[PDB]
């Protein structure tokens, strides 16, 4: 049905293979236009998410663009301590660091990446340079598709992003059918990581605190029932 | 005397208190690193009238473009009908109709309007910068973020952008300057 | 009567050399063994909740300020530094942000408890005045604070809630510029707000000092229209340990729910648009400032000369009182009248548990509050305009006319004696 | 005796409805008409000076924080933004920076006035304890504050006065890292210091609250070893208006001199090297932290195993108590012993105006303080080492041994009766 | 004698012709190596110092180096609202924004610029790339000039700055002998301006406050003498 | 029982209070954006032994340079006499004499010292960066800020700089790596 993720609930600590797949997808597809400045590269070793091997992290970092410096202007080797690059303009898009919170979030990305079908039977010609999406709601609409008072008759609208993937864009090393849907789910989970890395710690803290406070509250209820006994016994 | 001396001491205390309080209320006013920002001048100085002129201010561009006759006639030949925003967003005047006579600009300290037009280069849809130099389907400006077609005088057309390009408060400095603010 | 029982410092030599600094005398005699009635329901806890929430907010803020950098170019980045690198991070921020919500929720129940059981009625005016002063301070605080992340909603909320001060004539733009540090919003506003936001809580604590001093000198309301009968008072058990423990139990429950929220539903009360950096060139849809200011936002954006009950066309008699100024006055009055209440209710009576008509009007008032909360978020298009106008009109009507009429013809009830209600 | 004269709230209806919140009762009965002796010299003013200076610093700081940006890359720039663009600028900064100097100068005279006229002697121990606590808080505050400009002296002063905590064994490096936010100094330290620096003054005010509560409950010391003779007390005129006006006159003079300094000699008490940005790679000559910490800096850097009176070679018996730790303990003890004084002076007597030997030793102590101040700035090369060692030794000797011996054999003086000294 | 300046005292509000002369020198001599980032270009119109004509300020600004931007990387027109440029390295020196306070200050600059005489008769060969200054004290010294315990026998030391001026380096428009000494004094005053622009306001505030507080203090003394009269009359 | 129940409630309250307090004292410790900084590795990986290797760290450069025989022999032929700073600033060992045997570096996890030398590229005079690649009057490093001549092993010579080039704490990672911190 709704294709719920793993983390959608009181449990679900970010199944990591899914995140490694999303990383294969993000660095080879989405990175061409998008960036994640709010994301340090070293986080690809921190627990909770992709617990990759540090050495591979340093390699992948040195293999990225050149972030010059802060003290002496000079194109450095881009050490992991720096942040992911930033694609800013000239046919590029926003930053995906926290896009999983600026919208139930990841379901938006899934049902957005999912859905770029051809132009409907109201404006088949479409638009030059703009492509159609069935779920983006903040895009333009031709006058042919609007109602009598400016509202659109289409489910979604026209987004400036092209279709990101075809039937079998990339291979998975673990062994898995790399259709469009699985890639969309995986990349959605990866972005949710990039936004909420400390999710599992959140849940564990919540459990511990609920327990301890229920205990404290029960003990206080007993103490209250006791103290207030000689005044609530005859009635 | 009792009265005089006592009341005078009180008055002096009050005066000193006020002289000490005023700066605590003055420091919050505009510091020097901002007063200059309010008034910014652009020296047109032979911009080769007819192509364009852009300058940074308030973090947004301020478009100062001369007029090309073909652009002008296309402008002056636009009846208010079929005009999305007929309010003449320009804040240097009242809500008078979005007409080219009112919508072009002041007259150099002289008497003429169909030669210069300085507006805020910020699309009213979501704040993108339209491309100039005769573009779009109306011989004006084209917004590449979502496809909004502007006209010669800057009034919005053919797109989601609800209103035209606003016009900040600006007056001339005697035939070679512009005052933005 | 009013047994203070100073303890006479007879414990031992330690309690006798403490005759240099009385402090323990104060605590014991007054702030712990303060005779409180037995008839207290579960509505007299929220003050402890408010005190604890205030302490919590102050602490978490003092911690955050060790990592927040007030500047347009480094605020968002510092907030992310917090939520990612710092050890506890997300906890402090979510506890700070949501705890404000609980704070205001708790003051709402604290205030409406008061309106019911005649806690504003004499001889408890000073407490009411101080409470309204506080409410104002804490509203201003939360406002200054929502700005610091320099998100997108921050900018525009500040923009409008500062254009208010500029609406008024003659001294509007001057005040606006003197408050923003300039013509529009920029880093200067941010610095002012951070400082101010990091200073008012202490003023609030002091005001809470006077708040607590007042209702210790003046007896706690009690469910009925009766006092502790000072003249020895078998009623009026002490505060410690009984009511202390009761309040702590309720507080444990409340914190349990609060942490469950923090850990499962933390971004629920927030606005997602505050997670995208600011663009002074683009405004999002449905700014919707927050949820503890929607009532007054609606009272403001209701009067627009768009109804047959539009008093703006009549107030236009004077060419100076335009619409904007009218709405601003309406909001300031919505609060000033709540403050003036104790001198409007012309009743020699007390808690509405013995005033039926008052019960009905009061529940209508609670409903009006909820409705205003729900309306400030919805557009100004029909029919919501009529709804907002009706609700504001009823608020003002209640607080101005309804209470006098009741005080006149509202005594069909047998008042209870003997605050010792052994039923 | 101890006439409080509560005023009985007999003024009028206003002073009768104020029976809800006592406040004016407190002010009048206690904090204004507090009977103070007639025998007060000009040394009992500096408390008013300290209160006013504290208010001044708090205000000016709240103003500066509206323009200071805590970050390594934008602190210096913000300070210059202040001194150039802002309207008042230089005034606030110079008044903030120098007023700290006056604050400490005034506490020095406040403290040494005390040591003379037996103000630490019973029954005035609590005041002394609270005062030492304050002194500590305000030292830490000024330290946190000298760092914020991110000049050159800031960095290195912080470096050393944090390496202190690291000297001790086992838990030194951990505390160092937990305090600096890391191995060495960087923006994290700056944020901590700014927050902390913007918070302690309020704790100081509260502690000043208790400071004022104590010596109102306990009578002000007086030049004589006598009390106000409570049993009606023709002596002991009230505070208002007499002593209020006297203190305000002295305060006007002091502010006059202070503003003359601010306007003609403002950069005199400062270190020029704090006007060059920081270089973690280059250290200047003669860091010379400040002038209100030189005594303890010298007591610290004196013990180095470089004299025949070097007790470090003897303390090396235990392999853990090295030199550094020894100096740190020596400084902490230099303060702890001053705090312990009231339980070391074994005299059933009072103000040294009737104890000659005490006069001589006390003037030697003042000279020792001045000498230590002058020595912390000069290198550790001969002969200054012997001087510093002698001075520290005398400080400790005074406070440990000298007072007992006096209390034993120090009563060749006729004590004065009748605090009404109409001479 | 000591060649005291105008501002050296309780008065002396920065004789402005001196500052215009110092500006003519700073932009034509010292600017080649030094900078003043902590100094906006719009201060050359603010009162107190050189009250130049704004238009000339805009011209002189546009005629300087290119300070690119803060939002969109693009070499602009170096608008006055920006700050003076910065010369950083490769044969360049520090920033002179507040050098008049990081040292009686301006006298250091005067007696420093003044004094680059030839190498003394202890090390006439000198050093390659370093030049000798009578007053700089933080420079190296050859071993031939040091005493038995490392202390130098020379008055000053060797500074990395070359002699900035000759006998008649520039012309003054007002009409004045432009010898080295006058230029040194003028530039020293200009730097003191760049460091303390709000000096005159300082002095005027000091005067006003001294006066008002003397008045208040006198009145309080009278009030005290009065109140304490019936208790200090018999003795 | 009275005693047991009361004391146990108190104990539980205390435990919960402490569990809530600890993080308020933990957040001030070193955040994630700094823990990484403490440990930094440099992959030597065939640096063409003999010329140089520089890497940024702590805001200052860390010089990792292989040894050239002529440079070595000049080093090992320096008696402690006539050596300004004979303390061997290297913090990976005690204040042992500034000798090349102790002053060069650890031995790759093997046994040899006259082949690598990694020091802090920061002049002890006032913190400038000396120029490398065989410079100065001693075949080592030369500081252009004031003229301080360093030697092959980094010990200060011929200038105001009081002490030699310090050596941070560093150990090897089994023949291809360096650990700085
Ligand atoms: C350029 C060829 C792109 C690549 C490849 C990808 N994206 Fe993108 N994206 C691009 C643009 C120009 C825009 C703006 C669209 C607009 O109309 O404004 C976007 C937008 C997105 C969004 C935001 C949608 C929204 O509601 O605002 C998302 C969530 C997004 N894109 C996701 C995404 C992913 C996961 C990609 C890799 C699989 C990816 N995009 C590639 C440009 C380009
Ligand atoms: C390069 C050709 C220079 C020009 C022209 C001027 N200065 Fe300079 N200056 C330069 C350097 C490389 C240094 C550093 C010297 C050192 O040994 O470190 C300096 C230094 C100064 C100083 C600081 C002196 C001190 O005590 O640290 C001052 C006050 C100074 N210079 C003044 C100055 C003036 C007024 C100039 C124009 C008349 C000027 N300098 C030109 C490089 C160069
Ligand atoms: C010691 C400092 C401090 C105190 C005291 C404090 N806060 Fe804050 N507050 C901050 C900081 C820092 C931020 C920005 C970081 C953040 O948003 O969490 C902030 C942000 C906020 C926000 C926005 C939260 C967000 O994430 O957008 C609100 C709402 C708020 N404060 C309300 C309050 C209220 C109400 C009080 C007390 C009456 C209070 N704060 C006390 C420091 C403090
Ligand atoms: C605008 C009104 C208002 C506000 C806001 C308010 N109070 Fe009260 N408070 C009252 C009134 C009325 C009473 C009843 C006093 C009585 O019964 O004598 C009261 C009572 C109390 C009590 C004792 C009885 C009780 O209800 O718990 C406490 C404790 C208390 N308040 C704390 C606080 C704190 C802490 C805050 C804010 C941080 C606060 N209050 C805000 C008006 C207010
Ligand atoms: C509300 C904020 C605030 C308060 C309260 C405050 N200060 Fe500061 N202080 C600052 C700021 C901001 C700076 C940095 C700007 C500056 O140096 O003037 C600073 C800097 C300082 C400095 C260094 C001055 C300089 O220019 O180098 C000292 C010393 C100092 N504080 C001491 C104190 C002491 C002592 C107190 C009270 C006991 C105090 N401050 C109260 C905000 C404050
Ligand atoms: C370490 C000691 C110490 C410190 C520091 C200190 N005090 Fe006191 N203070 C005393 C003592 C002792 C007395 C004498 C009390 C008495 O005579 O009963 C006193 C008395 C006073 C008095 C009343 C008589 C007088 O001397 O003026 C005031 C007012 C006062 N202090 C204010 C302050 C303030 C404000 C501060 C700091 C901001 C401060 N003090 C710091 C110890 C201290
Ligand atoms: S932003 Fe200009 S049209 Fe969408
Ligand atoms: S700084 Fe390296 S020698 Fe002067």
Author numbering:
A (entry chain D), E (entry chain Q): 5 to 107, 126 to 257
B (entry chain E), F (entry chain R): 11 to 191
C (entry chain C), D (entry chain P): 2 to 232, 237 to 428
Quoted passage from the original study:
When similar analyses were carried out without imposing C2 symmetry, three distinct maps were obtained for CIII2 (CIII2 c-c, CIII2 b-c, and CIII2 b-b at 3.8, 4.2, and 3.5 Å resolutions, respectively). These maps were superimposable with respect to cyt b and cyt c1 subunits, except for the FeS-ED portions. The CIII2 structures depicted by the CIII2 b-b and CIII2 c-c maps exhibited overall C2 symmetry, but in the former the FeS-EDs were located in b, whereas in the latter in c position. To better define the clusters of cyt domain of cy, the docking analyses were repeated using the three different conformers of native CIII2 (CIII2 b-b, c-c, and b-c). Interestingly, when the FeS-EDs are in c position (CIII2 c-c), the docking models gathered as a single cluster on cyt c1, slightly displaced toward the FeS-ED of the same monomer. Thus native CIII2 is not always a symmetric homodimer, and the FeS-ED of each monomer is free to move independently from the other.
In R. capsulatus, both the diffusible cyt c2 and the membrane-anchored cyt cy carry electrons from CIII2 to CIV in respiration. Here we report the cryo-electron microscopic (cryo-EM) structure of this functional bc1-cbb3-type SC (CIII2CIV, at 5.2 Å resolution), together with three structural conformers of native CIII2 (at 3.3–4.2 Å resolution).
